[PDB]
Each structure stands twice: as structure tokens, then as C-alpha cells.
Design a protein around this ligand. Sequence first.
Ligand SMILES: [Zn+2]
Ligand SMILES: [Zn+2]
Length: 431
Amino acid sequence: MRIVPFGAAREVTGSAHLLLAGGRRVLLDCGMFQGKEEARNHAPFGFDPKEVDAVLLTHAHLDHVGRLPKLFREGYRGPVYATRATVLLMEIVLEDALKVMDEPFFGPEDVEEALGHLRPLEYGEWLRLGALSLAFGQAGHLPGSAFVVAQGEGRTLVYSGDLGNREKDVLPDPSLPPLADLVLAEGTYGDRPHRPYRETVREFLEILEKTLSQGGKVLIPTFAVERAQEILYVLYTHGHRLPRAPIYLDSPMAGRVLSLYPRLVRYFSEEVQAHFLQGKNPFRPAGLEVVEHTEASKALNRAPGPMVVLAGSGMLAGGRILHHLKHGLSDPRNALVFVGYQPQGGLGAEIIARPPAVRILGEEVPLRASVHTLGGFYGHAGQDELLDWLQGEPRVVLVHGEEEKLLALGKLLALRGQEVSLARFGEGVPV
Ligand SMILES: [Zn+2]
Ligand SMILES: [Zn+2]
């Protein structure tokens, strides 16, 4: 039994790991590379897509699902398991990646073909392939997200997939993994623990009252798949103490996702499920308004506050948000609220550095709006959470994360008596 990293090696995008065992070849995730590595989606997988006996998806994020169509484009015609939630989310995530994609490395024929082989596999349901036994575990990172438990040949392997931030309220807490011979885990935040959720939420409310009371705009750059709706849930459970103001979710995609959440009630925490039982949708706070097209979206730049605006991309890589920031960052009555990690050297960090001005869409725009970073809203299991999850596991291979973040986690692991290494592209590891 060997597990061969084929992506997310000393990096965060690309997640895809080939499991060789029981005389079968099971592919764990098949995501695309993003940002600078984006051009590697045109290169070959590094293995023979036609020799895979089945593939498993831990969640719908494009970076674990993005290359699936390519896998089908190049031959594969086997099954692709995922939780029903991932199965449905996946459709929205792929269609959008197709549409909004300059250098397409796959086409509509592939998406269709790819979605055609999806089969539901829910938490605690064992798949059988040869002498192999596989099962999903509650990962708590996205609705219907899981870590993989692969067993066979008397050995046990665990692929963490992405582990969510247990402090947040929307998804359920990650399940501990079973005792295993090898754990292939992520380490997106292996260097530090997360800022407490409760205190971030409180600070968030303060920012909203001060800004909206003064007639200002709260600009919140966010991702469309889970962060957006999570902010809405917080606006729903606290909107009772917040000044009345429209909440514009300026993301069609975030819309499509939100529309789908009621079809996924079971995929959320007890808290969230209790709200749905009362017959209420806790993801639609009073005043919510999904904006569909440009014309209305641009209107928001000229309209006065108070208002709360959610728009992508979550890392300012582009998207409707740049247009809001452009016209709003100059007014001191506004507030910018980051609810996701802003990588180094990005327009995000640049603004957080509080310079006198910033360059957005071809112009130098004074930065007078207030800036705030609500780290307690960050996505992955932070370092402390990583340590607890990994606890008691003999060997650990680290993937998904910047080299330095991975090492930091390694150090602690090493010092804990745990055998650790940093996955290398193509180099398989024995279980
Ligand atoms: Zn993810
Ligand atoms: Zn990921």
C-alpha cells in the first residue's frame, strides 16, 4: 500500500493523491492548481488517468475538484464518489470554473462526462474495491466535506483532506481520525493557531454598528462557496441588534450556493439544523439581496450607505469587489473587513499595511476607509487544532500548505515523537 502525492506538495493548490493498494488505483481528490501555478493544469497529471479504478472527493472546492473534468478528458471513465452535498456543490463549482476561465484546459463535454460518474457515498459508508475498504469521516470544512480512511493489506491510511476550523458555528466539528499507520494531512496554518471565534464575532458587530450608524458602507471581500454564507449566518443571528441596512451579496455564484443550502440542512451543525427545524433559513438575514448583474452592481458604488457588501474574489484576485473597493476605500466613513487570509504580496496585505494609497484597477486610490482583519473567521484547522487531530498518530506526511508553514508544524510533530515528512511530488509513500 503506497500513497503518491500528485499535488499540494509544499503548496496549497493541486490536491490529488494516488492510492495504490489491493491491486487497485484509487485517486484521492483531483483539484486544480491556482494563482501562479495555474499553468500546471495544462501539464500532465504524472500518472495514467486510464488506470484509475475509482476516485474520491473530499469536498467541492475547485482546488480538490478542478481537474476532475481533465481526468475524464484524458480517458478515465470510472466512478467518482463524494457526499451528496459535495456532489451538488460540485456542479456549481465546475460550471463556474468553465465559464469564468481564460485558459480552459477542459471543456463542457468533460464537465458533463465527469458529473455523469458521480455516485453518493456518505459518512460511515464503506466502499469496497478489491481487498480495499474506504470510508469518509466528518471533516467539518465545507458542507459534506470529509477526510478519507483507506484500509487494506492489514494497514490503515488516513487522508485528512481539508480540516475545518472547529471554532466556527456553521459546520459540525471535525471527527478525530482512527488510529492509523500513515496520516497524509494538510497544514495550511501549521505555523500558528487561529484567533478565537467569539472575540472576532464581537469585534465584527462593533464595526457594523459604528459604520452603519454613521451611514457608511461595510465592504467584505469573500469567497462564494462557504465564507459568504457564513458571514450571512452571523448577520442573521445578530441582525436583531444591528442597524437596518440592505445586505447586498454581490456574487451570483454565492447566490447559487446559498440557494442550495436548504437542500443541505443535514450537512450542517446541530445549531444550524435546529434553526432549519424551526422552519427558518438562518442564512438569509433580513435585508439580504443577491445582485445578479453588472449594471446594478456598479450602481452600489454611487449609492450612499448604510449598507453591507459581500463580493469576490475573496483575495482580491479580481471580481466585482475591486469595483467596490475602488470607489469606497477613499471615504473615511466606510470600513473594509477581511474575513479570510490574505496571502503575502497580494492587494490584500498591501492595504493592510495601511499605506497612504493603493493601486486598484489602473488608478491610485487614497485609503481612508477603516481596515479590519477578522482572523477568527479563517478557514482551516489552525496549528493547535492540527496538533490535537494528529495526536497519537505514529507517522505523518504533510501536504497542502506553504513549505515554511508545513515545517513549523513538522517541528512540533517531530519534537512530539512523531515521524514526519513533507510530501514530494510524484514520490509515493508506503503505508
Ligand atoms: Zn477547502
Ligand atoms: Zn484546499
